[PDB]
Amino acid sequence: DSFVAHFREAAPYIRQMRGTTLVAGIDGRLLEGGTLNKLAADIGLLSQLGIRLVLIHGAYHFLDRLAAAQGRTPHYCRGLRVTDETSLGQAQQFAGTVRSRFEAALCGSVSGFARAPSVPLVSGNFLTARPIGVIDGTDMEYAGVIRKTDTAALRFQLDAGNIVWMPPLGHSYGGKTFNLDMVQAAASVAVSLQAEKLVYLTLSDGISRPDGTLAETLSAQEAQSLAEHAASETRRLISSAVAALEGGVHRVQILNGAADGSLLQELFTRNGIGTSIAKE
Amino acid sequence: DSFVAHFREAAPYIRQMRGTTLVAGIDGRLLEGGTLNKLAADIGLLSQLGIRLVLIHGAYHFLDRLAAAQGRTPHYCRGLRVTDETSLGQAQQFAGTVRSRFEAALCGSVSGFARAPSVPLVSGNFLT
Amino acid sequence: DSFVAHFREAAPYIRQMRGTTLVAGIDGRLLEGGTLNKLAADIGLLSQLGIRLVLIHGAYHFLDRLAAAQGRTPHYCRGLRVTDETSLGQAQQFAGTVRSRFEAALCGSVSGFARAPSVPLVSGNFLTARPIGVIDGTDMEYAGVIRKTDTAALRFQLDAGNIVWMPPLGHSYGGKTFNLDMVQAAASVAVSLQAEKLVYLTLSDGISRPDGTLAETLSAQEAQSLAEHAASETRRLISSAVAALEGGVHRVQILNGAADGSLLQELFTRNGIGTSIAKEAFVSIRQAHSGDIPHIAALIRPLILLHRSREYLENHISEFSILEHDGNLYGCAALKTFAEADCGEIACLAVSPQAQDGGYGERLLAHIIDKARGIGISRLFALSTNTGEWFAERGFQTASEDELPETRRKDYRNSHILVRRLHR
Amino acid sequence: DSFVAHFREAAPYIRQMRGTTLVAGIDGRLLEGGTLNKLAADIGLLSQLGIRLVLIHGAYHFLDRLAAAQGRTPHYCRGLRVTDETSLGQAQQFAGTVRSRFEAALCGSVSGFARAPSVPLVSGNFLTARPIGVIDGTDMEYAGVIRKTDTAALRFQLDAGNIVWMPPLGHSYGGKTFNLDMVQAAASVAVSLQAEKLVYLTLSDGISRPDGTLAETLSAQEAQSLAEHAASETRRLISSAVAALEGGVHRVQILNGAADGSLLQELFTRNGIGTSIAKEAFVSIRQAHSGDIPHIAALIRPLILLHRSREYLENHISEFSILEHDGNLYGCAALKTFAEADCGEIACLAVSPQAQDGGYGERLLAHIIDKARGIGISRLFALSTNTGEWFAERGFQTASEDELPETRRKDYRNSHILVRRLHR
Numbered sequence A: 001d002s003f004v005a006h007f008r009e010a011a012p013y014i015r016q017m018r019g020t021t022l023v024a025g026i027d028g029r030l031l032e033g034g035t036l037n038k039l040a041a042d043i044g045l046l047s048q049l050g051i052r053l054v055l056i057h058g059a060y061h062f063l064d065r066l067a068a069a070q071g072r073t074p075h076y077c078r079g080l081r082v083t084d085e086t087s088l089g090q091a092q093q094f095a096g097t098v099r100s101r102f103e104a105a106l107c108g109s110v111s112g113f114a115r116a117p118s119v120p121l122v123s124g125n126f127l128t129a130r131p132i133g134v135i136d137g138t139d140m141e142y143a144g145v146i147r148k149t150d151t152a153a154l155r156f157q158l159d160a161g162n163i164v165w166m167p168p169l170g171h172s173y174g175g176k177t178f179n180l181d182m183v184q185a186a187a188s189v190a191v192s193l194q195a196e197k198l199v200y201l202t203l204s205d206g207i208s209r210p211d212g213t214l215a216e217t218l219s220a221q222e223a224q225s226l227a228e229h230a231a232s233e234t235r236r237l238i239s240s241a242v243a244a245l246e247g248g249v250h251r252v253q254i255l256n257g258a259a260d261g262s263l264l265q266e267l268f269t270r271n272g273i274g275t276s277i278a279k280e
Numbered sequence B: 001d002s003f004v005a006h007f008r009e010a011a012p013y014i015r016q017m018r019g020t021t022l023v024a025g026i027d028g029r030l031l032e033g034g035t036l037n038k039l040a041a042d043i044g045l046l047s048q049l050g051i052r053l054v055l056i057h058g059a060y061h062f063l064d065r066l067a068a069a070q071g072r073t074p075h076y077c078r079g080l081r082v083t084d085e086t087s088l089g090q091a092q093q094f095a096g097t098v099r100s101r102f103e104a105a106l107c108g109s110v111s112g113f114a115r116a117p118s119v120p121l122v123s124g125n126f127l128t
Numbered sequence C, D: 001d002s003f004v005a006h007f008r009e010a011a012p013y014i015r016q017m018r019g020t021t022l023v024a025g026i027d028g029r030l031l032e033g034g035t036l037n038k039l040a041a042d043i044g045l046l047s048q049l050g051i052r053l054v055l056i057h058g059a060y061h062f063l064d065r066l067a068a069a070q071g072r073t074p075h076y077c078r079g080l081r082v083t084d085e086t087s088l089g090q091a092q093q094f095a096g097t098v099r100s101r102f103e104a105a106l107c108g109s110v111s112g113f114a115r116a117p118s119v120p121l122v123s124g125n126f127l128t129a130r131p132i133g134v135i136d137g138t139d140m141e142y143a144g145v146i147r148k149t150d151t152a153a154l155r156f157q158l159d160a161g162n163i164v165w166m167p168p169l170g171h172s173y174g175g176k177t178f179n180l181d182m183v184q185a186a187a188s189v190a191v192s193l194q195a196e197k198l199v200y201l202t203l204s205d206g207i208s209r210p211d212g213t214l215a216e217t218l219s220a221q222e223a224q225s226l227a228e229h230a231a232s233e234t235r236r237l238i239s240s241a242v243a244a245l246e247g248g249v250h251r252v253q254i255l256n257g258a259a260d261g262s263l264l265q266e267l268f269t270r271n272g273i274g275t276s277i278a279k280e281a282f283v284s285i286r287q288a289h290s291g292d293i294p295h296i297a298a299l300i301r302p303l304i305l306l307h308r309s310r311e312y313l314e315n316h317i318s319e320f321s322i323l324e325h326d327g328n329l330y331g332c333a334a335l336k337t338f339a340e341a342d343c344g345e346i347a348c349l350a351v352s353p354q355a356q357d358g359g360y361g362e363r364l365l366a367h368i369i370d371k372a373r374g375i376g377i378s379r380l381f382a383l384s385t386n387t388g389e390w391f392a393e394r395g396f397q398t399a400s401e402d403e404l405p406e407t408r409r410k411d412y413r414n415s416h417i418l419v420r421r422l423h424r
């Protein structure tokens, strides 16, 4: 269509998004190739439209490849990862590497043809975690869950215009580090700060129905139906999205982070691409 | 010496440090042992006394000890270390590990016997 | 001790005191000699550590000496001074003189060797007073009591960093001045602004017991006991301290203002010098929360302890109890339970060397046997590799592994196994 | 009178008005001649004394003349104007012209001899209106009523020191303009922002009584009485004033905007010119508090009075009553009581010379005999050295000391002792 027709459709969403909080749970796999640079440039723009952004990457696939590649097969126990000392150790390393990689991409990306101000990015000690403990007799070791979240520190960073970067790691009162599950920690953080949007950036178009068709919009009730017999990965997502919706998050959106402009199509058009989920 | 003699000498400097900026460059070897804990604890204390703290850690020893262990020999020119792809890779990794290690010590430590607020730490794309 | 050890003890109190409000009722007699200069320098420092300070001097002794010296013997009527026009008149004069004297001392004092900013001091019309009237037929004349206090003006001065100076005088809506009683007006002001501390600077070490020993800490209940038969001066103090505590003041402290550094020893050490008074007993035992884990960890490090990778401390924090004295966490203990309902285990009993040999362990043991009895459990176990003698001296007999609960016997495969039978 | 006497009367009102909000409904007719310039200069001054001002002009007379002059006779339907497209059209034009005219007058007016800053004036889209619809079968066309008012925008303009100018027009969600009725929209706006004053500037002195006399003060109840049979114009006013009072506006004042200085006489003197209206009767009698002591003292000074050292005024304030008119404390009286339960004494009856010979004393006497009867007491005494004739004319007979209560007889050892017997 014409430029005007598209702008008439985008502009209201710009009015609405500005000042809004959006929590992005980003798949670890997206933070490397040509995609990283694409994500960073688009995430940059959102920041520049005044959306308050909290970013959280995942790491299970990288930890899973890395383990296999060195002899130890990874154990999941009713769905959550067992994380031993070595893995924890590599998890800290991975967060370091992905953090750097993202700052660089952010620094070297462009928004258009004119010169923009640079984009401020921040991390800190916002999440205090605790060990899950033992499940079905199995020790979950350094697998952890959010205990306490420094919501006031987050709001403070966000009110100042900063993008907040969180790794799937937390510290404990007992002085140790724990591996968090990103899909869940993003849901939990979003509930904590009453975020208007929780966005999962995945390698998939969103939630497909048993017949292949991309869902598109789901109520929580319909989402739980879909989850009955579906892949534990799509099951985890939905379990977490519904919990977010239950806690007050307005919308949870699931997209393909490897598809060019996905984020901009989802947030600024009425149909979006991907799957939108709401309480009712 | 007595408490009051010690408090008397210390108190002026508290008055002076509050609102002061202190940039600390910390040897990377310092962020592992019981020294970590002992350190994190005191940085923790400084922070509660209103000092403004900017911590910057080193890596050269880590990277050189990581080289020896794997056959490579570190090359320095005019004090500064030559840094290959692989080394840069190892540094981003090391940073991850030490930033976590330090956060955990901080969270797990104590100023005194009374319950106190937790100490906020922040990082960011400050350096181009 | 070393500098470091002293600083480790003072620093937390500096974190805590800053932003805090402290009301000082200062004895008139302290505002003259070498002591004045000492007080002023120390009060200066406190101001410089960001403590919010409201100062109020007394005057009865000066008014009492001055009257005697000119023929009129002073009348107290059930404890409070009768203040006639002449005395009132001299009271206004005295406040003037003591005010000047204090500014000068403040101005000319030093805090250390380096150059500090000067210390701002302020007074104003904060107290509106009213006449007590007549008691037992006697006219109290210009003796007065606080009617209304400009709390918002005070907070305003204090938020700006000013020391506030109040004389024991107030004005009335009827356009006259009244003599206040300092001990009481300080209590009243402190209640008004919900001050964390009310400090009485006296010519005495604090409240002594009938046997001479300095008290040290008192609950309000114990303080009122002491007051039954004691000097009307120590009686007035306690009557006012208890009222402050009743109104919300956290602590009321009584010291010797003529003893060098008193104020600094009281406020920045755990023991203090002098007498500390609180609404309830110092020492309480409460249920632990995630927030206490680091204190419990630090209370355990000095050992005799598993606790490296993840924890039982994390997920079972709720079954720990901690002992605190005056806000300091000095001990902890846990009660572990079993598939067997009549069993339990006391675990992690620890009191820091700092507070040790003072009865706290035993208070923790008493507390957890009560918790255990409260839920059935008739046999309480302790397994320990070194602390056996303590429990053995305290009702625990040695037991054999064959007496352990299933899971515990499994674990124990290794030191002294002791039990004590409890009364349901 | 002297300059000082006038300034003593104006100054308090300046303290009070500043920060206050005042909504002025101005008659359209006032916005043209020599009067416009007068209004603008006075309105300027008010602005400069920090009064928050919201101005709203009327237009019915101009719309009514304009219609007649071009053949169409104006229809009112149960009191409100029918406004057709043409009229609406002219109404927009009129608001434009009156707006300009007012800015010019404001710009070119002066406040005194020295040079003042200019006076900021602002309008915007604060009122969203809706059509009244149909009444008694008649279509009211573009006649409208306030639907929604942007109170936050108004407060914002006002906090910044701006005079706000509103025309009697509003827009609708349906995208059309409507004619508002000024008298009503001013009442509605005033209720919306909880204004302390709603002022109607008219071509009349205020509300006259059926006999010609200017009213002056009215309670709402009395105002509604007056409205029963009066001109629909004075009826509209009162209907709107009462609604404002009902919604929280403190006072509604009605004056002559064409009388020089009217506004300044109304707002800064105790009597005003014009008509003041309040929710409840002006004049109330309430129980005294410590806060009134200075007013009572000042009410007593002019005498006949003990009251030097300390007071009975201080500690027995609770037994005083004060009479106020429109917020002014003009009188007081006390009831003193006795070991004898059937006795009492009226003491300190005082009404300031300023408000005297206006019935207040007697209202205070009536009030305290009711208090006294409410507690038994069948004999009320007054002892007075000069005011005997007043009480003697008002049911008090002379009594002998032998009738006094014990304590009172003791005290009296000396002027006229009078009593009045009361009905239990």
Ligand SMILES: CC(C)(COP(=O)(O)OP(=O)(O)OC[C@H]1O[C@@H](n2cnc3c(N)ncnc32)[C@H](O)[C@@H]1OP(=O)(O)O)[C@H](O)C(=O)NCCC(=O)NCCS
Binding pocket: C303, C304, C347, C348, C349, C350, C351, C355, C356, C357, C358, C359, C360, C361, C362, C363, C384, C386, C387, C388, C389, C390, C391
């Ligand atoms: C056991 C302990 C916690 C009790 O603490 P406490 O606060 O001193 O308790 P109390 O003051 O009630 O008891 C003091 C008495 O116990 C004595 N005591 C200390 N350790 C003892 C031991 N191992 N065996 C016997 N008695 C001991 C003290 O010398 C003191 O003796 P006294 O009263 O004749 O002067 C003790 O303080 C301690 O030393 N704890 C060390 C760490 C620990 O206990 N770890 C694990 C325990 S399961």
Ligand SMILES: CC(C)(COP(=O)(O)OP(=O)(O)OC[C@H]1O[C@@H](n2cnc3c(N)ncnc32)[C@H](O)[C@@H]1OP(=O)(O)O)[C@H](O)C(=O)NCCC(=O)NCCS
Binding pocket: D303, D304, D347, D348, D349, D350, D351, D355, D356, D357, D358, D359, D360, D361, D362, D363, D384, D386, D387, D388, D389, D390, D391
């Ligand atoms: C007595 C007093 C308080 C009553 O006040 P008030 O508000 O005028 O009361 P009212 O208006 O109901 O009474 C007005 C009438 O009282 C009259 N009056 C005033 N003082 C009087 C007196 N000493 N003797 C007789 N009548 C007197 C006024 O002239 C007026 O007469 P009028 O109604 O025929 O015109 C009076 O106002 C007064 O002058 N008070 C002076 C101070 C005082 O009273 N001190 C102590 C009293 S115990």
Ligand SMILES: NC(=[NH2+])NCCC[C@H](N)C(=O)O
Binding pocket: A013, A216, A217, A251, A266, A267, A268, A269, A270, A271, A272, A273, A274, A275, A276
């Ligand atoms: N998959 C969808 N149906 N998306 C609708 C998105 C609507 C809107 N632009 C938003 O970001 O919330």
Ligand SMILES: NC(=[NH2+])NCCC[C@H](N)C(=O)O
Binding pocket: C013, C216, C217, C251, C266, C267, C268, C269, C270, C271, C272, C273, C274, C275, C276, C326
């Ligand atoms: N006399 C005492 N026991 N004093 C204890 C003082 C403890 C603490 N430093 C305070 O100022 O409150």
Ligand SMILES: NC(=[NH2+])NCCC[C@H](N)C(=O)O
Binding pocket: D013, D216, D217, D251, D266, D267, D268, D269, D270, D271, D272, D273, D274, D275, D276, D326
């Ligand atoms: N008409 C009257 N009675 N006016 C009294 C006005 C009193 C006061 N100055 C005011 O503006 O409210």
